[PDB]
Amino acid sequence: GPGFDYAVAMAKRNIVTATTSKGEFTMLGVHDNVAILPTHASPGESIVIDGKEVEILDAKALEDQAGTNLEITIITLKRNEKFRDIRPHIPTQITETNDGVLIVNTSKYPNMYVPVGAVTEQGYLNLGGRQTARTLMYNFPTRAGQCGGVITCTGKVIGMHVGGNGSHGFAAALKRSYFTQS
């Protein structure tokens, strides 16, 4: 109810569908001209956003102080439109919740809200060599181009879906320090 209303608000205001080389993805707008996507979406020099080609200025793929990939990429965009600033809503520390909502917004999964329940910290996800840090985990039957989906609990955006399997989703946690000071 309040958890849900938040998720809907966030989708309206700050979530868009973005197309790359690699396909459509849910993308979060964070502030100004800055937005995040799964690193594996592999954004180029431009990205389509709700019909429109948009020039990508910078593209930063996040790693930890060890150079392990966090599976998130920040992109600054050549655009006039500004996003509602949601840095206050992104926690300073990796956050868990008993009542997660996953938000997905593509042509396949438009404006789709999935309460996944418990989102727990698992830290190091070591699959193959392809290790990753700061992951979250939740029960969700994952397919494909749910990638980019956003995890909420009330007032907070805590995560970004980047992975999964038959029974579980994997997100990259969000920390306010990933963006500029306020």
Residue spans per domain, the chain: 1-14+84-180, 15-83
What technique was this entry resolved by? X-ray
SS3 154: coil
Enter the resolution in angstroms.
Answer: 2.4
User: Do the domains 1-14+84-180 and 15-83 sit in the same CATH topology, yes or no?
Assistant: yes
Q: Dihedral of CA 115/121/122/124: which sign?
A: positive
Q: How far apart are CA 73 and CA 23, in angstroms?
A: 16
CATH code: domain 15-83 is 2.40.10.10
Among 24, 31, 89, 147, the one annotated catalytic: 147
Among 31, 71, 153, 161, the one annotated catalytic: 71
Q: Is 153 a residue of the active site?
A: no
Q: How far apart are CA 33 and CA 30, in angstroms?
A: 8
Q: Is 147 a residue of the active site?
A: yes
Pick the CATH number of 1-14+84-180 from 3.40.190.10, 3.40.630.30, 2.40.10.10, 3.30.70.520: 2.40.10.10
The tokens for 83 are 């996003």
Q: Is 89 a residue of the active site?
A: no
| Residue given tokens 């039957």 in the structure block | 141
Q: Dihedral of CA 116/118/124/126: which sign?
A: negative
